[PDB]
Amino acid sequence: KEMPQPKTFGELKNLPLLNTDKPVQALMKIADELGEIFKFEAPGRVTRYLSSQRLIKEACDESRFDKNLSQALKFVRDFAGDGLFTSWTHEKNWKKAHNILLPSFSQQAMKGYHAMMVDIAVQLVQKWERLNADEHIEVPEDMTRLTLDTIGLCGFNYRFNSFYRDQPHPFITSMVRALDEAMNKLQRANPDDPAYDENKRQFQEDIKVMNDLVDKIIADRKASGEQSDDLLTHMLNGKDPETGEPLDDENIRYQIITFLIAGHETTSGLLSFALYFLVKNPHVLQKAAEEAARVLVDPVPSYKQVKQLKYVGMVLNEALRLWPTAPAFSLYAKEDTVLGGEYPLEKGDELMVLIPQLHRDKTIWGDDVEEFRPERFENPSAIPQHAFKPFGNGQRACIGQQFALHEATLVLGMMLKHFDFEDHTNYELDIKETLTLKPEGFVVKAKSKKIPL
Numbered sequence: 001k002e003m004p005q006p007k008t009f010g011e012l013k014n015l016p017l018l019n020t021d022k023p024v025q026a027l028m029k030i031a032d033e034l035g036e037i038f039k040f041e042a043p044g045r046v047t048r049y050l051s052s053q054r055l056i057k058e059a060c061d062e063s064r065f066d067k068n069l070s071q072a073l074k075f076v077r078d079f080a081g082d083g084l085f086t087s088w089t090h091e092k093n094w095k096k097a098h099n100i101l102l103p104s105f106s107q108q109a110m111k112g113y114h115a116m117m118v119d120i121a122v123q124l125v126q127k128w129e130r131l132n133a134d135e136h137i138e139v140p141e142d143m144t145r146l147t148l149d150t151i152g153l154c155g156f157n158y159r160f161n162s163f164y165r166d167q168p169h170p171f172i173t174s175m176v177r178a179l180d181e182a183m184n185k186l187q188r189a190n191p192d193d194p195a196y197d198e199n200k201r202q203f204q205e206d207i208k209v210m211n212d213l214v215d216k217i218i219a220d221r222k223a224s225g226e227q228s229d230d231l232l233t234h235m236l237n238g239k240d241p242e243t244g245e246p247l248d249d250e251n252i253r254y255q256i257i258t259f260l261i262a263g264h265e266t267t268s269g270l271l272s273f274a275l276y277f278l279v280k281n282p283h284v285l286q287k288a289a290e291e292a293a294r295v296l297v298d299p300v301p302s303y304k305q306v307k308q309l310k311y312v313g314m315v316l317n318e319a320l321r322l323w324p325t326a327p328a329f330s331l332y333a334k335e336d337t338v339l340g341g342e343y344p345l346e347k348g349d350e351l352m353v354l355i356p357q358l359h360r361d362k363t364i365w366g367d368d369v370e371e372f373r374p375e376r377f378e379n380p381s382a383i384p385q386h387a388f389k390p391f392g393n394g395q396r397a398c399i400g401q402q403f404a405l406h407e408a409t410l411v412l413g414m415m416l417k418h419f420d421f422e423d424h425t426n427y428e429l430d431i432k433e434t435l436t437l438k439p440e441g442f443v444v445k446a447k448s449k450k451i452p453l
């Protein structure tokens with residue numbers, strides 16, 4: 001069976017198709033044209049993009065496929081190193097860090113982070129309470145202030161103080177610029193060409209900034225001896241039950257860098273898409289606002305109250321369905337195997353899972369896949385296995401899933417309790433790609449309900 005393949009460019013094969021500032025959205029369009037699987041070739045490499053639950057349920061069989069580092073992740077590894085996100089499953093430091101960190105990310109571990117999440121959420125609510133009448137909110141900008149600050153504080157007892165700034169912090173300026181370089185390197189022939197000497201110079205300097213700050217945080221905390229019980233504490237003290245070993249300080253640095261990138265970016269995207277969909281669907285916004293008012297009966301939300309925001313959780317899942325903010329992941333075949341009864345693969349062959357396309361599979365979701373309908377998630381158990389994968393798969397799934405969802409549920413609950421929202425520009429969705437996805441230029445107005453904190 002000849003696997004479908006999109007248009008080619010002579011000796012460059014399919015590579016120029018990714019020479020665009022919206023590559024995921026381009027791949028989605030190709031998937032619409034070509035169906036559940038297509039081959040994608042560039043000089044010296046091939047992968048296959050999967051979009052159906054029928055095929056993806058096979059790819060998610062951990063006995064048959066393991067996480068691969070995409071080229072994107074290999075480039076991110078230059079600064080995220082052998083942190084959890086950019087490590088191979090077979091690296092000693094993956095299993096050690098996994099075993100050590102997993103407990104501290106449980107739905108139950110969120111009880112300890114809740115107060116610090118509220119600290120940052122209240123800063124956001126106060127910002128918006130303090131806007132004057134004519135003024136508006138830059139949504140992804142403020143969500144990114146929130147989610148960065150939340151992972152910084154809950155995770156490392158460090159305050160980025162993003163709500164005190166227009167200029168986003170020297171660590172973050174570097175981190176953003178590092179991510180940008182990694183992204184550009186993808187659509188770039190002859191890496192060692194003298195032209196990119198300046199790009200390499202900046203890259204190295206940004207790594208230095210990120211490492212300096214973080215190693216200092218580490219060493220201050222070690223020296224100080226003062227004990228929170230936060231993520232960094234867990235790491236400095238905790239031992240892997242299997243090997244009996246702790247993480248070394250360098251790996252700890254890589255984990256912190258990873259959490260700061262991983263631990264905020266996709267979360268700000270989620271919140272921004274959720275608020276986008278709410279203002280475009282006023283009946284949904286009203287139902288969610290009713291729940292927030294009924295449940296959040298105290299000035300400060302409790303942990304248990306956040307767990308009771310069932311409909312707000314449905315809204316977030318439906319936002320993740322339509323626009324999963326980490327929109328792909330990569331696998332390789334552990335052994336020769338046949339995909340879908342039709343497509344033979346050799347050991348080592350790669351697959352890409354195109355999550356937004358999976359989440360539009362009409363055999364799973366019905367014909368109305370573009371509609372925003374939180375009620376799809378009335379009972380999340382009703383969704384078939386491997387149909388909904390915004391947090392990846394298996395032992396390599398997102399370690400931060402419960403953290404992200406607790407934070408997003410708390411913040412969105414507070415926003416809906418405290419304000420009415422207006423889509424005053426009738427905003428036209430424009431999704432910016434930086435590996436991750438966000439609605440660029442999304443702005444709203446928020447009129448206070450005048451409920452005291």
Ligand code: HEM
Pocket residue numbers: 067084085086098151258259262263264266267270324325326328329330390391392393395396397398399400401403404
């Ligand atoms: C809406 C928010 C988020 C989404 C959509 C998301 C999505 C994902 C996805 C798809 C993966 C799998 C990557 C792959 O297979 O290549 C992943 C892994 C990971 N995520 Fe997230 N994530 C989010 C939030 C967070 C947060 C808040 C943290 C940390 C606080 C975090 C930390 C990580 C880490 C460490 C991994 C690697 C886990 C491992 O392989 O051992 N994520 N995430």
Ligand SMILES: O=C(O)[C@H](Cc1c[nH]c2ccccc12)NC(=O)C(F)(F)C(F)(F)C(F)(F)C(F)(F)C(F)(F)C(F)(F)C(F)(F)C(F)(F)F
Pocket residue numbers: 015018023024027040041042045046047069070071072073186325326327328329352434435436
């Ligand atoms: O990075 C890669 O290896 C693959 C495939 C690829 C890149 N170059 C190729 C040449 C020939 C064949 C395949 C490729 N790149 C892509 O699919 C892509 F277009 F860059 C992509 F979709 F934007 C992406 F890089 F995969 C991606 F989606 F941004 C991503 F990086 F995987 C990602 F998803 F965003 C992410 F960064 F991993 C995540 F956000 F963390 F999930």
